[PDB]
Amino acid sequence: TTTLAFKFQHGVIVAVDSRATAGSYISSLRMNKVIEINPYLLGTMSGCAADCQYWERLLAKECRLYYLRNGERISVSAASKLLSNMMLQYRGMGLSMGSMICGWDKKGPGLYYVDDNGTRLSGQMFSTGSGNTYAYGVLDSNYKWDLSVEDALYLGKRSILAAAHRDAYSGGSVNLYHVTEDGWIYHGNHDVGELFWKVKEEEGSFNNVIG
Amino acid sequence: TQQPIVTGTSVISMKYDNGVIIAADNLGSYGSLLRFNGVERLIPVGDNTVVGISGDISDMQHIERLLKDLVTENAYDNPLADAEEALEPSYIFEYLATVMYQRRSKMNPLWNAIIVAGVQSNGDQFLRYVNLLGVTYSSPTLATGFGAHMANPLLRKVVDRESDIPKTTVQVAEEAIVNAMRVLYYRDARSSRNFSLAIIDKNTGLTFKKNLQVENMKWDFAKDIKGYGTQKI
Amino acid sequence: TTIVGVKFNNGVVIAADTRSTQGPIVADKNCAKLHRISPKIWCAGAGTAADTEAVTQLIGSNIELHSLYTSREPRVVSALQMLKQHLFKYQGHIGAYLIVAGVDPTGSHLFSIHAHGSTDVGYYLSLGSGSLAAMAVLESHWKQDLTKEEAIKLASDAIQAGIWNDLGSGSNVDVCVMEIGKDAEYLRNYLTPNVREEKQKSYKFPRGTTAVLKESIVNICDIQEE
Amino acid sequence: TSIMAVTFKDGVILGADSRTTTGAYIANRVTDKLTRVHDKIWCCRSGSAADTQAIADIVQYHLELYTSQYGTPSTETAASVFKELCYENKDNLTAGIIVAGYDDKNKGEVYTIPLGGSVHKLPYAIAGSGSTFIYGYCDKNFRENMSKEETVDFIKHSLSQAIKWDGSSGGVIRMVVLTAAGVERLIFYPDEYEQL
Amino acid sequence: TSIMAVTFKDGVILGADSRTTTGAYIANRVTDKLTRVHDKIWCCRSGSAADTQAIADIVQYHLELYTSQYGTPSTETAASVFKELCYENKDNLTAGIIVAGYDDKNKGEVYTIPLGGSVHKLPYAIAGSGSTFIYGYCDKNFRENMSKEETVDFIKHSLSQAIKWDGSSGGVIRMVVLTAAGVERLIFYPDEYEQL
Amino acid sequence: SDPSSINGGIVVAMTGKDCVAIACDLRLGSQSLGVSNKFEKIFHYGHVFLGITGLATDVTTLNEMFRYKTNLYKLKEERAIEPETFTQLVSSSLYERRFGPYFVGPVVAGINSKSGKPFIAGFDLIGCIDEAKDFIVSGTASDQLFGMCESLYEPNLEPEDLFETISQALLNAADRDALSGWGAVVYIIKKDEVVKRYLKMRQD
Amino acid sequence: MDIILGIRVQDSVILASSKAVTRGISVLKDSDDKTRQLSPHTLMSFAGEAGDTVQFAEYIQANIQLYSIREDYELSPQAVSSFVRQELAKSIRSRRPYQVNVLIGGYDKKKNKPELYQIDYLGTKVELPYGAHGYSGFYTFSLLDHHYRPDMTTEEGLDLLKLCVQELEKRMPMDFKGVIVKIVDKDGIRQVDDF
Amino acid sequence: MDIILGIRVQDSVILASSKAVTRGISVLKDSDDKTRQLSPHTLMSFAGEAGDTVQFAEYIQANIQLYSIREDYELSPQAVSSFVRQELAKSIRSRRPYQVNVLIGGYDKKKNKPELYQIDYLGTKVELPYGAHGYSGFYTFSLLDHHYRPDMTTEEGLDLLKLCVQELEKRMPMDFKGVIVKIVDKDGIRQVDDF
Amino acid sequence: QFNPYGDNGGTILGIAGEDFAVLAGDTRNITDYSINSRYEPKVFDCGDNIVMSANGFAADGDALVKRFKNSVKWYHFDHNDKKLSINSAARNIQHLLYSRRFFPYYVYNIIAGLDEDGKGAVYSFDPVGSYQREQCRAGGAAASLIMPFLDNQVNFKNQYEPGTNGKVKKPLKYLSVEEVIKLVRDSFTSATERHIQVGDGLEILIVTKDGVRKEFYELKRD
Ligand SMILES: *[C@@]([C])([C][O])[C@](*)(=O)[C]([C]C1=[C][C]=[C][C]=[C]1)[N]C(=O)[C]([C]C1=[C][N]C2=C1[C]=[C][C]=[C]2)[N]C(=O)[C]([C])[N]C(=O)C1=C([C])C2=C([C]1)[C]=[C][C]=[C]2
Ligand SMILES: [Mg+2]
Ligand SMILES: [Mg+2]
Numbered sequence A: 001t002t003t004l005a006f007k008f009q010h011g012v013i014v015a016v017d018s019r020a021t022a023g024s025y026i027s028s029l030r031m032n033k034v035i036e037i038n039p040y041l042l043g044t045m046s047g048c049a050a051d052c053q054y055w056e057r058l059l060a061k062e063c064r065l066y067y068l069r070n071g072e073r074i075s076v077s078a079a080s081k082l083l084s085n086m087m088l089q090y091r092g093m094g095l096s097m098g099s100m101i102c103g104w105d106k107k108g109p110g111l112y113y114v115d116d117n118g119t120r121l122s123g124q125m126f127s128t129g130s131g132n133t134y135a136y137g138v139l140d141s142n143y144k145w146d147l148s149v150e151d152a153l154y155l156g157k158r159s160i161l162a163a164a165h166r167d168a169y170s171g172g173s174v175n176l177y178h179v180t181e182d183g184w185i186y187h188g189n190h191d192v193g194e195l196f197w198k199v200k201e202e203e204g205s206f207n208n209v210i211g
Numbered sequence B: 001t002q003q004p005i006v007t008g009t010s011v012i013s014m015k016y017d018n019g020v021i022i023a024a025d026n027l028g029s030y031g032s033l034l035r036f037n038g039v040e041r042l043i044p045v046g047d048n049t050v051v052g053i054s055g056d057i058s059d060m061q062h063i064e065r066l067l068k069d070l071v072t073e074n075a076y077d078n079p080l081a082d083a084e085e086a087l088e089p090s091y092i093f094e095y096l097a098t099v100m101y102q103r104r105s106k107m108n109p110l111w112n113a114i115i116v117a118g119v120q121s122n123g124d125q126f127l128r129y130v131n132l133l134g135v136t137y138s139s140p141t142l143a144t145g146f147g148a149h150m151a152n153p154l155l156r157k158v159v160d161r162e163s164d165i166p167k168t169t170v171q172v173a174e175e176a177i178v179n180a181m182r183v184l185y186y187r188d189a190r191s192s193r194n195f196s197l198a199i200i201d202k203n204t205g206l207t208f209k210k211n212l213q214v215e216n217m218k219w220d221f222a223k224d225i226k227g228y229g230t231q232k233i
Numbered sequence C: 001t002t003i004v005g006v007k008f009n010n011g012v013v014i015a016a017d018t019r020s021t022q023g024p025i026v027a028d029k030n031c032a033k034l035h036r037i038s039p040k041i042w043c044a045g046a047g048t049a050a051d052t053e054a055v056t057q058l059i060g061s062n063i064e065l066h067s068l069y070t071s072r073e074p075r076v077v078s079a080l081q082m083l084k085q086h087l088f089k090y091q092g093h094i095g096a097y098l099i100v101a102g103v104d105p106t107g108s109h110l111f112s113i114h115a116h117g118s119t120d121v122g123y124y125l126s127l128g129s130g131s132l133a134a135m136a137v138l139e140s141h142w143k144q145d146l147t148k149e150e151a152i153k154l155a156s157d158a159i160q161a162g163i164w165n166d167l168g169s170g171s172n173v174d175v176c177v178m179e180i181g182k183d184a185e186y187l188r189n190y191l192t193p194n195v196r197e198e199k200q201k202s203y204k205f206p207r208g209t210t211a212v213l214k215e216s217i218v219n220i221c222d223i224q225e226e
Numbered sequence D, E: 001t002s003i004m005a006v007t008f009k010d011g012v013i014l015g016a017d018s019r020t021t022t023g024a025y026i027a028n029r030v031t032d033k034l035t036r037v038h039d040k041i042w043c044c045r046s047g048s049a050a051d052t053q054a055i056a057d058i059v060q061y062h063l064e065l066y067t068s069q070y071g072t073p074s075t076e077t078a079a080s081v082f083k084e085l086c087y088e089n090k091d092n093l094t095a096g097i098i099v100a101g102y103d104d105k106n107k108g109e110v111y112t113i114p115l116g117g118s119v120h121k122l123p124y125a126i127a128g129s130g131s132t133f134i135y136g137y138c139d140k141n142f143r144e145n146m147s148k149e150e151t152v153d154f155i156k157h158s159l160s161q162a163i164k165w166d167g168s169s170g171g172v173i174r175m176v177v178l179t180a181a182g183v184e185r186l187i188f189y190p191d192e193y194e195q196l
Numbered sequence F: 001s002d003p004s005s006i007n008g009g010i011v012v013a014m015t016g017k018d019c020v021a022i023a024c025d026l027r028l029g030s031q032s033l034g035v036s037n038k039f040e041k042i043f044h045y046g047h048v049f050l051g052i053t054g055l056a057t058d059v060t061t062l063n064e065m066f067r068y069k070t071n072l073y074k075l076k077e078e079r080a081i082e083p084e085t086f087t088q089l090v091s092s093s094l095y096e097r098r099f100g101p102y103f104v105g106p107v108v109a110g111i112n113s114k115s116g117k118p119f120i121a122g123f124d125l126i127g128c129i130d131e132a133k134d135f136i137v138s139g140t141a142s143d144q145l146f147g148m149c150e151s152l153y154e155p156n157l158e159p160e161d162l163f164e165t166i167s168q169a170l171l172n173a174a175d176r177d178a179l180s181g182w183g184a185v186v187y188i189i190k191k192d193e194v195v196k197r198y199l200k201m202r203q204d
Numbered sequence G, H: 001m002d003i004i005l006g007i008r009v010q011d012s013v014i015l016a017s018s019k020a021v022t023r024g025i026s027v028l029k030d031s032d033d034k035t036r037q038l039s040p041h042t043l044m045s046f047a048g049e050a051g052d053t054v055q056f057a058e059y060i061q062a063n064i065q066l067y068s069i070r071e072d073y074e075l076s077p078q079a080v081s082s083f084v085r086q087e088l089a090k091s092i093r094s095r096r097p098y099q100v101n102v103l104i105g106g107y108d109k110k111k112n113k114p115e116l117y118q119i120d121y122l123g124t125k126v127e128l129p130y131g132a133h134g135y136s137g138f139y140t141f142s143l144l145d146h147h148y149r150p151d152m153t154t155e156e157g158l159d160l161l162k163l164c165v166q167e168l169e170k171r172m173p174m175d176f177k178g179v180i181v182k183i184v185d186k187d188g189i190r191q192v193d194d195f
Numbered sequence I: 001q002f003n004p005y006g007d008n009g010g011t012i013l014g015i016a017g018e019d020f021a022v023l024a025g026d027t028r029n030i031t032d033y034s035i036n037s038r039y040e041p042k043v044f045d046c047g048d049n050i051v052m053s054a055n056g057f058a059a060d061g062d063a064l065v066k067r068f069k070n071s072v073k074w075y076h077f078d079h080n081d082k083k084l085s086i087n088s089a090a091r092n093i094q095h096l097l098y099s100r101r102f103f104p105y106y107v108y109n110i111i112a113g114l115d116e117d118g119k120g121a122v123y124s125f126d127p128v129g130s131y132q133r134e135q136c137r138a139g140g141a142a143a144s145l146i147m148p149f150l151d152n153q154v155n156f157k158n159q160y161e162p163g164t165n166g167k168v169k170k171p172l173k174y175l176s177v178e179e180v181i182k183l184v185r186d187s188f189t190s191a192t193e194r195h196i197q198v199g200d201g202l203e204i205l206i207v208t209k210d211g212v213r214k215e216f217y218e219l220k221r222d
């Protein structure tokens, strides 16, 4: 996999690939690596698929119970911490999970990286999975806070494409999300095969590839 | 986790038109040592079921006691213990299968391979296998250990599929089983000449044959065989 | 692999299945496991397939040169001795397990040979993953003073046992009959009990289905005149 | 495997079972473990079949060449050739060989060559996986200068017990009698020796 | 170790050597391997001395408590208590025990309990590292309903051979005779049994 | 670690009516990293075609070696080598390194210039020949290729139909393998004309 | 050693190679030149196991210089790359293989074209517009895939190269102490002294 | 994590801690604050295995804050350091020990003295004028041994600290992305925003 | 050392239609190179119009199916005989699998049926509990042989419309139950040829609004 997420002026972009592998065999062409915890909270998935699905769906249970008890939406900071504390219970037991908790709360847009070690980091931009290095290259050189919603969506889409191309264990399709103060907005499933040829022509990139 | 010490080799079985046949030799091996020569590895449960066991003998004796206790427990507060509410082969098998799978799940298995042969209340033939892993399967012919490699091929020539069962008589089926036991005696280094055979028929009931021997063996051709290649004398 | 060798009245017969595998995958559905060492000495091999071929070709080559040198027809004991001494030297690293059979001026012969260099003599033998299934048939039905027709039947029945009951064996049955005072008859695909049934559908595509970027003529001819 | 060689009044007798195993599978049930290296010098083989066959073949070659140059070799000489091969290649071999032969001068002799390549001249010798079970029986029942028929019975009874307890042993009991009269091969089937 | 128990006309006799080794060092050359769990129920021990002593002590406790409540226990019952301990603790034990006892109803009985914890009722039993060498001898020489003197000779000759070939066995031959008459202890020294 | 799956790649060959086809992907990688999308795995020595999968250094090395040997063959024999003969040369050359082998899965394809008979063959890394009538597969998606070929293939296909069958067999097998893809090439071979087509496929 | 990069533009080849040399936990040198001139228009950068790298590079250098003198002629970059590949392919099955990865940047004076060849220690050769060894490509190839054109100038090639080094300096845990950059074109080989 | 330094001057304690956080081969963050305020005049920096560090630091923080509320009183740095040491010494013989090394910088308001305590994951406590964990001391202690006086000002302490970081940046193979520096004195805890 | 796991071979295939679904699987059961049974059912009717197959280690497969069938029974008891929807069954199965995260059920599970809108549905699981709804899925021994064929012949991957040359894709027209069964039979016939663990027999369970129907077909026994 490749996943990314970044904060900007108009909220937070979330982009992931859809490939799943069992060794060198591509087990799945289209797997959903984002979880809709609530209208204002998202979770990315990298590592063991089962671990990612189980624990982040269990987080949604716990985030939902927070709302019922307090009559108020949980913060991104608190949600990320609940998850990191779950990981800390199964410390050294062999869980493999890398996720970014993305959302909007009273402090504004929030983004937290969380992994199986219990590591919990706040930040502007993150990328996880086998292809994160390829995505970071595009992100770092093209990122600004002053990005428009249209350009930001494209950056995250293009950054996944970069990784999908080079990384053998990333690809399939790109799933896009945009998080606002009114909630998250799904911006579709984009096949990499079709997207690659389109970007190559329009952008002029991938000159070395013949098409 | 353990290792098997005193062991029993192949158990072989097959279905025929009116019932099932099962057989197993009377040997208890201690590695390469043929230590115990009077071991019964077919254990009847009532008059409608025979459980054949291979593998570790100490675990076999434990299973033998569980079955003996199962009969006792089924009779408790049961006026129909010798009739409608008697133990069926399917009940006995599922019990064992439950035990085997639980034990493997605790990483402390009963180091056995078991075949439950019998006839149900409605006359249907019952033949199913279970082992130390809790793996279960059924087939017109079943065999454990070496029997799976050498006996099944011979028995499947008689009953190759389900439709061959009504066409197979008890004389033909017994003949096939007895021939298979001879072949195993030729080729299994952990086998013995002495064996037991059991027939469970829906009409004639349970027939249990002890102290059977492998006979009509071919050895004469050995005299002509000399050396390992070039030697003539 | 399933292979057998059976002696009879005036000669010897060998047989084999036709499946070759790459683990659980079938690479070749109609492999040829019956190899020729000399015209009337044939062997059949299990184990490492390249080793059984290479070692068979090598010894067969040296046997031919020996036959030319001595002005005599090759003997099975010669092939046997040359094979075992070669295999012993490589201490089992050449994974060749063979059944060697043939006729020569001395008579009819049947041997087995293992990868480490040990040889055996017998009237009926079996090698490979299906050896036990085949041997069960041989021990059930073999007898002294078999005829040619009875031995071919026994041999193919033994291979069938392997085909049906062993996952490492399958497809067809090959046979070679070596009778004294006769040419050896190689019966390729003597039995064909595993023909694939007709498919339910034709998967022939419409022309133009596949997307193409570039086309070009490949020059396979040499440099031209003028 | 169960093998033995026994000296007696008129010469020496070699005896062996016929079972060859690959684990628990009996690869050959009618094996001939009594192998000839010279007219009246035979050996019994135990251990790796590949190793023992290769050795016996080389020894047979050495004794054929010895005979062409120097005449009929002694049993001691044959045992020395076995030893030299087993001892110098001990790191790459697994061979336990019993050598037995007849001279008119020395009569019946028996030499045993265990794993290390040592040589031991004995009145009788036992070897193979099944030999362990008959150390007590053979020690109690062996006598020097037995008759041919007494010696055949001794080997038959001994190997019968070895076969009875050892799963790696079995099949028929082959024997080879070495005397001035010549070379006699014997065979005894299960129905005979099992009921002893 | 070389141990055995043999039934005969008047009851049963247990026999054993007296050697205990720590590798090649003989830690005790006069060991008593014949151990009493009840008046007329004794056992022969093989394997880990710590394990077999701990088991026999526990069994002795169970049979003492059985006797206080239900009267004199059978030999079968004693063997069942041994079995239950050896079988349920098989992962942490290395014990090979032969159980032997006398009733007036059942007379002389012998049960052997090898490593796994299985039980086998037999006419006679042999066990220990030295037993391997006398499987053939004992099978050939054992008869049912022997006299006391015949049975003593059988055990003496058998263990003599086991001691002769097994380095882990040796010392004196101890025996315990179990009959209606009572309990008789016997001992046989090297100078007696070595010359057999 | 496994030499046969470090660089990745696949090759497939099929027989048709008076024709043969051989195809390969263009990927070369260092495990997860894609390095080249122009690494062609099919070579030709006269009218005999050789596809090689596996360790890229050995692929390159063997091509150079068979070029060496076929050029000498031609100088001495005064004629181009035939597919049947070349197949034996490949087998021989691989087995001479029995205990230090080239980590490759070669595939021969061609038409005998005299008989006109189409010919294909495959080998293991050690030289064992697989002379199939229908098709030969090799590479990291060999399991995938076996499934596609076995279901899509039918005998006596015409060149332009065979093209579609082999192309779809390769393309869809490559799309279920992480270590294969990044382009594809198909050779359509007839007795005296050979066409080479680059396929359009997904580049992930 | 660690990072070596290469890029082929319109009329030249640019090679960038790290300056760091580490021994134990200490950086012994921060100005090391991981390259050898094989011929006036052919440059080879290298990275791999300590000691082996320089020994291999100098051995190749000696062989190409010997060829140049013997024939009074400069071998093409393609010919040199093939010679180097064969030596590595020969080496990988030796008793003790040379663990060296190389980039060969050369200007072919016959064809008037720049050429970049990437060869790893196994003898795996590929001609590329841009290349790298080890982990360097993981960070940089996405930038090169995006920004690279074949008609780029040498100055544009250097700017794209700076962006690659900046990305490496940001996302690598490894301090490689900057890079020495060298340009190979029709006029020969020269070093960019300010980078 | 990697580098944490500490120095006790005349009237304050200065802690410097690296900003880098690495996961796999990628630097995920270059602005991470590896420290927690235990009380108004006590600061603890930490370094060790991923996840364990923050969990341990926050657990200690909670305990000291609980004590502060219960007694309406701030524990001395010495008392806090002893509490922390015991927790680590308790931890090292647990089923799964916490692999965390800490520096505790505090100003004792009773004695009017700065105090620096170095504690490793085994529970090995030492009071020092300057300290470090891991490999940091190998590069820096020679400079500190030379330049350190006990009557140094806070500004002189920062200058000596800069020299230590410069030496680390030169001789370490590791890019730790600079340091966050914090000062602990009578007026409390503050961060040096430009370093 | 005791190995609690084993491999019983076999291969399974689930395809979702427009208003139907199929779940197929071969009937061969094996260990190593031996055949245990030529007919050992692997696909089961679990009630509530749901079919299920747990392929891999048969003992774990039987245990899971047995537990899910039990879960359906208790769902009726606890929730007033309410029908267990396919999506609800799928989520329940995830929790059954993850309850053994640290000693997994060694099986690749597939279920099939109809969603609450009456449309065909297939859900597929890994051994530890990751699941997702799919249109097409082959599982088990010959999964890698079959899936590419289904990508091509069910979703028309890499197929374009003649004349356009790669510009226009082949349109994704729906498949009938008769067309799907043809693709299933050809998938298993092809898998039987090239995979030694596949053969003997093929059993297909078809699910519609009318209920669950069975179809059996012979396969090669070599
Ligand atoms: C990259 C593709 C590679 O790592 C990415 O990380 C994905 C993330 C992902 C997250 C949620 C859902 C799907 C994918 N990871 C995987 O695909 C992982 C990688 C992996 C395999 N083993 C392993 C991994 C990671 C860490 C430790 C160990 N792959 C899996 O989890 C494997 C086990 N799963 C499958 O192959 C299948 C899944 C999931 C699935 C299958 C097979 C079938 C039906 C439904 C789901
Ligand atoms: Mg002694
Ligand atoms: Mg990719």
Ligand SMILES: [Mg+2]
Pocket: H118, H119, H120, H124, H125, H126
């Ligand atoms: Mg310290």
Ligand SMILES: [Mg+2]
Pocket: C162, C163, C164, C165, C166, C167, C168, C169, C170, I221, I222
């Ligand atoms: Mg078969």
